Design a protein around this ligand. Structure first.
Ligand code: HEA
Ligand code: HEA
Ligand code: CUA
Ligand SMILES: [Cu+2]
Lengths: 57, 49, 235, 29, 18, 31, 522, 24, 49, 99, 262
């Protein structure tokens, strides 16, 4: 959907922090699997395991 | 007025008319060829699954 | 369909997108051609029928009210030529309908695709890199420089979205049989919602230049039905 | 005066001779 | 004259703060 | 000059101006 | 003064650009025939050398500045151009850029990536053949030299207005290139800033148009658009001035609608900046934004239509005298009406989504820019050349050059409107097999047009040999034949050397210092 | 025009597509 | 700023206070006939103007 | 602007002939307007041609009206009235002359 | 009396300075493109030095034409004034290009690398310690020369020298303070899409201001040889104030990063 960053941050600020049931975050997981690419997830997982990922957390 | 007024009126009005009949036969002929061929092909693909 | 030698028109419309583009194109060509018939009759009549006598007519820079009449006339030409442009942009721009998502990305010599509309029985998001066929690998039956080895395959009567980016000088995929044109920028993504009318393999090419390999980047797509796409396993 | 225009003419002369010596290195590596 | 002098005095007063 | 003030300098000047894409293409095809 | 060398460099670079045309089209004839380098090695280098060398080196200097520094002060009445020191600066800056551009072609590999060098990876990856820095410096010096000449033309027709002309009945070329330089001011230094931005990105690795750091190429895309759209209006509007003067003096010195004409040219100068838009309509901007864009390109299509209806009224009802510049003006008008028609065609919203980077836009812009600008420069040379050069130009060979150009360029750039809609890609070195038809006759036409250029060279060499029985007097006498003068003055200047049939009264060739006494208007 | 078309015919016609049968 | 070379700034100041301008700025349209019996008069510091 | 004020104003400007190129210039411009010339204007034209001591311009006005005369019927009517005017003038047709 | 045309002439086309500046620009081309990838460190400084020296030679010949030979008049005065007043409006465009580039980079958020701008990793300077002095030192520069101009009209020397020299000794202090600000800055040219748009829209002022200091040093060397006078309106006399209007539009740049940006 619009502003894919907001979808990814919505279900990424899920169960890492903000312990929530997996279904409302799973909706946005399925939203990110379509509509948003798969090659760059390695890049924006390297950004997260580095710790200077652009999410606010 | 006179001859140049008669000629600009007849000239521009017949230019309207000739451009209109050239593009009108063009659009009629080719656009109706498109409606025949494409709507018949879509009729085949839709009515015959 | 496919390009053909000595072709006047473009390929066969299989989208309501290309049906609308062909309709509006014939509309604007109609208004263009009445203006061309006008100006051709004007120039022929003036240059030939005015052989002359060596006097020219006296009247100097003037003609106020009839001149502003033929300045108001292009404005009504614009309004009648631009209302179908407005309605076709309003009909084509919106993407709200539910749709299958296939996403592309291209790196200077190829494309690759990913099918994630529907988490399948294996559950794995698939990839295949659509390379070219060079001079040694030529299937002599198929046609050169539109040769993509691993085709896209897309079900008929299904809304499809092309949600793409790129890298590695960027460029755009364009399939003129079904009329798609987007950015594929490195940082920004965009979609285009389009169903298809019929079945059959559709051919396209790369619009924007990438450099040393802008020639050898063909783009094709196959159009099947729902059960033939259902049988397409090992994606 | 011109007593400074003469060495300025000299340094301009070498400054427009030596890039023309640079360009065969630019084409040949 | 009054736009230069007193405004420049206030400028030099505000410049000494930081 | 005695034979060419501007009699051949037009032809030769335009021959150079037409032939410099040829020698640029030649030395770029030789790489 | 500057004008003679200023024209000689233009002809030199024009034969170079037509040689690039020859090579590119000779490769584009048949698939993979003449050259093995079907890549950006040598071929995109050739199309950038072609495009940037010819637009920047030919139409820009001769159409704005050659007729400017020879024919703006002589029509307004000025002695010399108001800053006589920096015309000399700008023009001698130019062939240094010719050397810089041929050096960009010559070096090891060649980073020639089209004339509209888009960043994302035209970066340091391409700078092993570092050409594109030399290409952007050649474009940068041509940029600032045209800027300098623009300031000079503005100040010359502002302060050195001879006491004839007020601002209400000005000549069309004078007011034309005043609008041209006033339009050039507002668009040149933006792209100068973009040159130094992207040169800093590709030299000192800060990379803000590149991929890394979140750099975005669309800012540069807006920038070079915002320059290159008024750039093509610079390319055509002094052409409109020259066509106005030749349409005037070969048929009927009462022309249609002066104040209307200069209002329409100011309307083009107003509305021509703020539509950079259609050139990448397609990129995925907002729908209301692109619709507003499409609506405003229609209103930039209005006033040029008003002007060509005016010249249509002008050639009507006048004693035409079909010399070679009148043929240039009538061919100009016929082909430019069709090119503006295809402009309205491309100017729609939902048609650039089918027409971008195909040969349909290529045939369109070659049609307007080539036919309009080069027919106007043809008219200008074959019009003002016996005044400046002093020699008569062998009218029959001028006629056969016109017909040969007309049929050659028409049979080049008419098949592109067929090759484009079928879905050709732009700058393709090796096109698919189903496109081999019309490119063959395009190659035939390219050889026709370069034959006509060589015929122009034989005419330019025939400028030596003083034919008297070939062409003597434009606007032959009406009913007099015993009295002898230049037969037309619609305002009564007639002061010393300036009149209403402006600057046909200097001498052939004009003196090294004319205009001793200030002229006056009635 | 005849010299241009004849010069085009006697400069190059060589090395094109594979064969007419391949197109078939 | 007096006693300097090239006194063209003299007659700007001189003509500024006395009327007679410097470099014949003024126009002319004497509403005449243009006829050879009484042409427009020509005054110059020369035989040709 | 109309027919009659045109005729009056340019006959008044036309009896200011006094010369060859003056009468030929006023013949040119008073002939080149957007109205056919009045017969009184061409009678003053022939009388001014007698005044300025020149015959071939008195031929030239007739081929000028032969072009501008816009039909053949007004041409024969002008041939009639201008014919007995020629009998009191002495000027020939070009078609009677064969150069 | 023997009269003339008001506008004037120069030395003809075989003149060494127009060939000098052009061959100099070709030397600058070869410097910028051969140090970049073959690495000749010495001669890009040589090209900049010969550019400065040829500019001062060209300027020295034209000010010799101005006063040492005495050519310009009121029409040419109005012409040079209007030309280099429209040069201000030409500079407004290259200004507004960078202005609109930063306006686009801050109005449209890039979804990567700090969606909120300034990004996560780069922190902007507080505008109150040094920049609160910067806006007031620019305001004082723009506020005391409009009285220095009436001081030059009035005919005295000490008051005009007082206002003039406090202005331009003060902006030499401004050169040093901008140098120490953009020396002490943590983030650099190679950061974000934020660094070398902010450093570009400060380095443009650095370039303009070192050219400004060179121009007014030559103006003061011209002033000390009794060249300029309050009646000597020759044309260089009026081209010395408009950089204060350039600094007012510099303050207009300055405001878009502090009150609206952060
Ligand atoms: C000097 C050259 C020149 C001129 C004058 C124009 C003028 C116009 N151009 Fe074109 N154009 C280019 C050169 C030029 N162009 C170039 C070089 C490119 C891009 C190529 C690239 O850079 O690689 C381009 C690209 C370009 C595009 C980009 C599409 C794409 O990239 O595929 C579009 C689309 O809108 C367009 C449209 C127009 C229009 C509407 C005009 C209008 O100004 C024309 C209006 C004129 C008239 C309409 C004619 C007179 C009127 C009538 C005959 C009677 C009344 C009729 C009507 C008013 C309806 N141009
Ligand atoms: C200055 C404008 C101009 C002119 C005149 C021409 C003229 C020609 N051009 Fe080109 N061309 C461009 C500007 C021009 N072109 C541009 C901008 C591009 C796009 C580049 C790209 O995007 O990379 C392009 C692209 C382009 C392509 C690539 C198409 C693409 O993918 O977009 C091709 C293909 O062969 C081509 C061919 C030709 C040919 C055969 C001519 C023939 O018409 C040449 C024959 C004409 C002449 C004979 C004129 C001679 C002129 C003079 C010497 C001076 C003027 C007058 C005189 C005094 C004589 N041009
Ligand atoms: Cu990208 Cu071709
Ligand atoms: Cu455009």
């Amino acid at each position: 959907t619009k502003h894919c960053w907001q979808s990814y941050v919505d279900y990424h600020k899920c169960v890492n922090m903000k312990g929530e049931d997996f279904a409302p975050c799973k909706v946005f997981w399925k939203t990110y699997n379509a509509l948003c690419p798969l090659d760059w997830i390695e890049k924006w997982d390297d950004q997260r395991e580095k710790g200077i990922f652009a999410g606010d957390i | 007025t006179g001859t140049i007024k008669r000629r600009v009126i007849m000239d521009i009005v017949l230019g309207f008319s000739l451009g209109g009949v050239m593009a009108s036969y063009w659009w009629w002929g080719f656009h109706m060829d498109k409606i025949n061929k494409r709507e018949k092909f879509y009729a085949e693909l839709a009515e015959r699954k | 369909d496919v390009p053909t030698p000595y072709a006047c028109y473009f390929q066969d419309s299989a989208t309501p997108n290309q049906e609308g583009i062909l309709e509006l194109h014939d509309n604007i060509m109609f208004y263009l051609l009445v203006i061309l018939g006008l100006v051709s009759w004007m120039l022929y009549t003036i240059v030939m029928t005015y052989s002359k006598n060596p006097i020219a007519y006296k009247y100097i820079k003037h003609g106020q009210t009839i001149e502003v009449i033929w300045t108001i006339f292009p404005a009504v030409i614009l309004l009648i030529i631009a209302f179908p442009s407005f309605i076709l942009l309003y009909l084509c721009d919106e993407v709200i309908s539910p749709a299958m998502t296939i996403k592309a990305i291209g790196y200077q010599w190829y494309w690759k695709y990913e099918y994630s509309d529907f988490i399948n029985d294996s559950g794995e998001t698939v990839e295949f890199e659509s390379y070219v066929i060079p001079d040694e690998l030529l299937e002599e039956g198929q046609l050169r420089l539109l040769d993509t080895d691993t085709s896209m395959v897309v079900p008929v009567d299904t809304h499809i979205r092309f949600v793409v980016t790129a890298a590695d000088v960027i460029h755009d995929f364009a399939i003129p049989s079904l009329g798609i044109k987007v950015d594929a920028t490195p940082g920004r993504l965009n979609q285009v919602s389009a169903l298809i009318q019929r079945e059959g393999v559709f051919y396209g090419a790369c619009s924007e230049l990438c450099g040393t390999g802008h020639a050898n980047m063909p783009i094709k797509i196959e159009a099947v039905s729902l059960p033939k796409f259902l049988e397409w396993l090992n994606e | 005066s011109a007593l400074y225009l003469y060495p300025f003419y000299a340094i301009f002369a070498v400054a427009v001779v030596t890039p023309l010596l640079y360009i065969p290195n630019a084409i040949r590596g | 004259w009054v736009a230069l002098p007193a405004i420049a005095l206030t400028a030099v007063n505000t410049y000494f703060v930081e | 000059g005695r034979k060419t003030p501007y009699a051949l300098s037009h032809f030769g000047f335009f021959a150079i101006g037409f032939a410099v894409p040829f020698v640029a293409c030649y030395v770029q095809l030789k790489k | 003064d500057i004008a003679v060398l200023y024209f000689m460099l233009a002809i030199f670079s024009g034969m170079a650009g037509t040689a690039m045309s020859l090579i590119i089209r000779l490769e584009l004839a048949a698939p993979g025939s003449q050259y093995l380098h079907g890549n950006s090695q040598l071929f995109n280098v050739l199309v950038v050398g072609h495009a940037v060398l010819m637009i920047f080196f030919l139409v820009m200097p001769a159409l704005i500045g050659g007729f400017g520094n020879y024919l703006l002060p002589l029509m307004i009445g000025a002695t010399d151009t108001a800053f006589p020191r920096i015309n000399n600066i700008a023009f001698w800056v130019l062939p240094m850029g010719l050397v810089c551009l041929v050096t960009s072609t010559l070096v090891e590999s060649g980073a020639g990536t089209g004339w509209t060098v888009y960043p994302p990876l035209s970066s340091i990856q391409a700078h092993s053949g570092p050409s594109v820095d030399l290409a952007i410096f050649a474009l940068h010096l041509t940029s600032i030299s045209s800027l300098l000449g623009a300031i000079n033309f503005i100040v010359t027709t502002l302060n050195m207005r001879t006491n004839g002309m007020t601002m209400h009945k000005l000549p069309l070329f004078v007011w034309s290139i005043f609008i041209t330089a006033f339009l050039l001011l507002l668009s040149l230094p933006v792209l100068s800033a973009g040159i130094t931005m992207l040169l800093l990105d590709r030299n000192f690795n800060t990379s803000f148009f590149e991929v890394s750091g979140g750099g975005d190429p669309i800012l540069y895309e807006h920038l070079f658009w915002f320059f290159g759209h008024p750039e093509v209006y610079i390319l055509i509007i002094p052409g409109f001035g020259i066509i106005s003067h030749v349409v005037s003096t070969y048929s009927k010195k009462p022309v249609f609608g002066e104040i209307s004409m200069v209002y329409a040219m100011a309307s083009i100068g107003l509305l021509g900046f703020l539509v950079w838009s259609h050139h990448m309509y397609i990129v995925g901007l907002d729908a209301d934004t692109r619709a507003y864009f499409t609506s405003a390109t229609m209103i930039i299509a209005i006033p040029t239509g008003i002007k060509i209806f005016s010249w249509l009224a002008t050639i009507h009802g006048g004693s035409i005298r079909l010399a070679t510049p009148m043929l240039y003006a009538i061919a100009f008008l016929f082909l430019f009406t069709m090119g503006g028609l295809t402009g309205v065609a491309l100017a729609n919203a939902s048609l650039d989504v089918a027409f971008h980077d195909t040969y349909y836009v290529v045939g369109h812009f070659h049609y307007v820019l080539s036919m309009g600008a080069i027919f106007s420069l043809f008219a200008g040379y074959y019009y003002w050349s016996p005044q400046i050069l002093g020699l008569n130009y062998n009218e029959k060979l001028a006629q056969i050059q016109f017909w040969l150009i007309f049929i050659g360029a028409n049979v080049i750039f008419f098949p592109m409107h067929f090759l484009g809609i079928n879905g050709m890609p732009r700058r393709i070195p090796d096109y698919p097999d189903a496109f081999a038809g019309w490119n063959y006759v395009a190659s035939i036409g390219s050889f026709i047009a370069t034959l006509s250029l060589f015929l122009f060279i034989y005419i330019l060499y025939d400028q030596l040999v003083n034919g008297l029985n070939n062409k003597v007097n434009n606007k032959s006498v009406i009913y007099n034949k015993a009295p002898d003068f230049v037969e037309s003055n619609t305002i009564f200047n007639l002061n010393t050397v300036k009149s209403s049939s402006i600057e046909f009264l200097l001498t052939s060739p004009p003196a090294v210092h004319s205009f001793n006494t200030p002229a006056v208007q009635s | 025009l005849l010299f241009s078309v004849g010069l085009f015919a006697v400069v190059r016609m060589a090395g094109g597509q594979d064969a007419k049968t391949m197109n078939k | 700023d007096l006693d300097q070379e090239t006194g063209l700034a003299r007659l700007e100041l001189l003509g500024k206070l006395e009327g007679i301008d410097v470099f014949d700025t003024k126009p002319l349209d004497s509403s005449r006939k243009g006829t050879m019996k009484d042409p427009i008069i020509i005054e110059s510091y020369d035989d040709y103007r | 602007e109309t027919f009659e004020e045109f005729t009056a104003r340019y006959e008044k400007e036309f009896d200011e002939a006094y010369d060859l190129f003056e009468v030929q210039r006023v013949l040119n411009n008073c002939f080149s307007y957007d109205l056919v010339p009045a017969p009184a204007v061409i009678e003053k034209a022939l009388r001014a041609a007698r005044r300025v001591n020149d015959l071939p311009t008195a031929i030239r006005v007739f081929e000028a009206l032969k072009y501008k005369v816009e039909n053949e019927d007004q041409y024969k009517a002008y041939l009639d009235e201008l014919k007995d005017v020629r009998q009191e003038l002495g000027v020939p047709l070009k078609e009677e002359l064969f150069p | 009396r023997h009269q003339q045309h008001p506008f004037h002439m120069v030395m003809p086309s075989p003149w060494p300075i127009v060939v000098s500046f052009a061959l100099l620009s070709l030397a600058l081309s070869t410097a910028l493109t051969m140090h970049g990838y073959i690495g000749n460190m010495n001669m890009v400084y040589l090209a900049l030095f010969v550019l400065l020296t040829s500019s001062i030679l060209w300027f020295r010949d034209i000010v010799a034409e101005a006063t040492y030979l005495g050519d310009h008049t009121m029409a040419v005065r109005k012409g040079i004034n209007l030309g280099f007043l429209m040069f201000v409006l030409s500079e407004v465009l290259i200004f507004a290009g960078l202005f609109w580039a930063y306006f686009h980079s801050a109005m449209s958020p890039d979804v990567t690398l700090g969606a909120c701008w300034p990004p996560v990793g780069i922190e902007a300077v507080q505008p109150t310690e040094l920049p609160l002095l910067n806006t007031i030192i620019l305001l004082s520069s723009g506020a005391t020369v409009t009285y220095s101009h009436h001081a030059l009209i009035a005919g005295n020397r000490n008051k005009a020298l007082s206002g003039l020299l406090i202005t331009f000794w003060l902006i030499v202090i401004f050169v040093t303070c901008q140098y120490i600000e953009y020396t002490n800055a943590a983030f650099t040219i190679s950061d974000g899409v934020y660094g070398s748009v902010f450093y570009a829209g400060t380095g443009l002022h650095f370039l303009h201001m070192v050219m400004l200091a060179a121009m007014l040093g030559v103006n003061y060397w011209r002033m000390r040889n009794y060249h300029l006078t309050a009646g000597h309106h020759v044309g260089y006399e009026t081209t010395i104030i408009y950089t204060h209007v350039l600094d007012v539009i510099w303050l207009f740049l300055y405001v878009v990063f502090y009150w609206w940006g952060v």
